[PDB]
Structures are given as C-alpha cells and as structure tokens.
Homo-oligomer: A and B are copies of this chain.
Amino acid sequence: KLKKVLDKLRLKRKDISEAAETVNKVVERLLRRMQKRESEFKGVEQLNTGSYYEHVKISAPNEFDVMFKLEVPRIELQEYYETGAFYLVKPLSHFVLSATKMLSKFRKIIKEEVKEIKDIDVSVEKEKPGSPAVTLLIRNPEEISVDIILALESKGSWPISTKEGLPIQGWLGTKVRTNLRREPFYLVPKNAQGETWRLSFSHTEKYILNNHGIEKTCCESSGAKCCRKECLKLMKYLLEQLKKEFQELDAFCSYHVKTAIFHMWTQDPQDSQWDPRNLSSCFDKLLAFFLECLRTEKLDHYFIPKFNLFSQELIDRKSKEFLSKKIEYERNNGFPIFDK
C-alpha cells in the first residue's frame, strides 16, 4: 500500500547516527566561534528546527536546519507594505538594521571557521539570494546539507499580523495557543529589500509537530498512534519526486505542503480522523485539500493569515495548473511516481 512507500522513506538508525555525529561536530564548532571571538554574535544560541528534528525527514538524513538566534532588546518593527510577513527592524552598531549587512558578516565568520576544519569534508555553498541561510555541504560519507539560519529573537508580544494566526483553539486549545504566543518570535534575514527581515515560527512548528494531537497521548507509549506525520511524509515525497522530474515546479517547496497539512489538522482536529487504519482516506483527503488550494490559488500562511503563499505574485497560474494535472494524474493511477 502506501505502507510500503513509508517503509522506503523511513530513515535508518545507522545513517541517522553517522550523519548526526558529523553534523554536530561542525555545528558545535561554528557555535563556539560565534561566542569566543570579540564577535558581534556573542550570545547567539542554537535551536534545531525542520524535518529531521520534527521526525518527518524522509529518504535519508541529509538535510539539517539549525537556527543561530540572538536576543535583541526592545526592537521596533515596521511592516514592509501590507505583506504581513516582512518588516524593517529598528554590539550590532555597524549593521535601520540591515539584514544583508548582518548576514554578510555572519557568513564571513562561518566561511573563515569552515576553512579551519581539517577532519570533515565541508564547504560553504555559493549564496542564493532569497535564502536567509548559510548552507554547508558536507561529504564525509556522502551528501549532507546544513542550513545555518541567522535569527533575531524578540520577547515582545507577536506582531499584529499574527493576531488571527495559529488557529489551534479547537484542536490544541486556548492554553496551548496562549503559551505558544508567550514564547518569543523570530526574524530571519530573507531577501530577494536588503533591510527586510521575515517572521519565522520554526520553533512553534516544531512544538506542533511533536504535540500534534487533540489527546495528550496521541503517539505516546500509553496512547494510540495516528498517521498525521505519515501523511506529511507522503505528501512531501510526492512533491520531491515531481519536483525532481519537472522544472515547471521550481516555485513549489515543502513549506507549501507543511502549511497545507497544518490547515487540514485544524479542519480535522480529532485523532480518530487520522487513524493509521485510514492512511489512504487521510492521504487522499489531503491531496484533495491541496488541489483546492491550487484551484482557488489560496494557501494562507498558518501564522500570518493575510499572506497568501499561492498569490499570483509568488507562483504563476500556469505553474499551479501544471502541478494540479500532475497530482490529479498520480492520484488517479495508483501513484506511479512512488515507484521510481
């Protein structure tokens, strides 16, 4: 079934162990260098985010996301247009706090430190505009990416654009939501302008992934297992496979699928609506939801409701119809792409 696919996607203990040991060496070293120097990033703290740390990494342990976040007292935001997600922001003297200038110095430091590593085969990938990350390419056994993500940490209440976000009230509840919104919020230097930062809720997304049930015992050793994470794996795999074959899908990414499933988990809050016995129905209903997002050109950021990830401005109508045909096809033919 889709069970055999999940078997293939399942990471191996051996591989996890080998990847993690190399990754931690490099990260531990980068993190130390940010402290030890008369460095403007002294104080930066490490936060592990994304799939591997959410336990929804598929295929291989080869992509790791780490936040190097820095406490910045009493900063003042100004929303960059009515975009909801992008802001100007107001030790760091030489960086309005310019995202690009801060990222550059951060990146310079990392590059320098990477040169000094003689026990691991590791380089710094050429910069992509649009990435807030300094990406490391590690080879030692085989290929592993590590994104080192610079983040400002603010302790204020979250910005107004998120007031109506995180609609978990009927699923995870009001106490969970109030507590989550008492955690700090993050600003990440995302930039295709050079002074614009972007809100990040990776920390919150991680908590949700690991506390995802309406029952406190969902997926615990004295609870019942659900198939919420397995659906997310399957959906991510369908996208990766399609994306590797079709250049038309360059504008799509796994965050789109993650956002979609957060909305489905809200819409279907009950653990019994994600029974492992109903993996197919569950996967199928997720596809149907994703297709509706494509058809209506609408997939709101889960934390920032006015920010449409499927706006015309971000992803072209044709790209959306293209992905629809390809999903509808896979869906109506037993997912041939799951075999390749």
Residue in B173, B176, B216 whose CB lies within 8 Å of A173:
B216
> Restricting to A163-218, which residues have a CB under 8 Å from any CB of B?
169-176, 211, 214-217
Query: Is there contact, CB below 8 Å, between B214 and A174?
Result: no
What CA separation (Å) do A232 and B216 show in the bound complex? 22
Partner of A214, one of B169, B175, B211, B217: B217
- Choose from B169, B174, B211, B222 the contact partner of A170 (Cβ within 8 Å): B222
Flag A68-85 by CB within 8 Å of B: 1 or 0 each. 000000000000000000
Neighbouring B residues of A169 by C-beta, 8 Å: 217, 220-222
Most buried by B among A172, A175, A214, A221: A214
B221–A172 CB distance below 8 A = no
18 further A-B contacts with Cβ under 8 Å, apart from A170-B223, A173-B217, A215-B215, are: A169-B217, A169-B220, A169-B221, A169-B222, A172-B216, A173-B216, A173-B220, A173-B222, A173-B223, A174-B217, A174-B220, A174-B221, A174-B222, A175-B211, A175-B216, A176-B216, A214-B216, A216-B216
Chain B residues within 8 Å of A173, by CB = 215-217, 220, 222-223
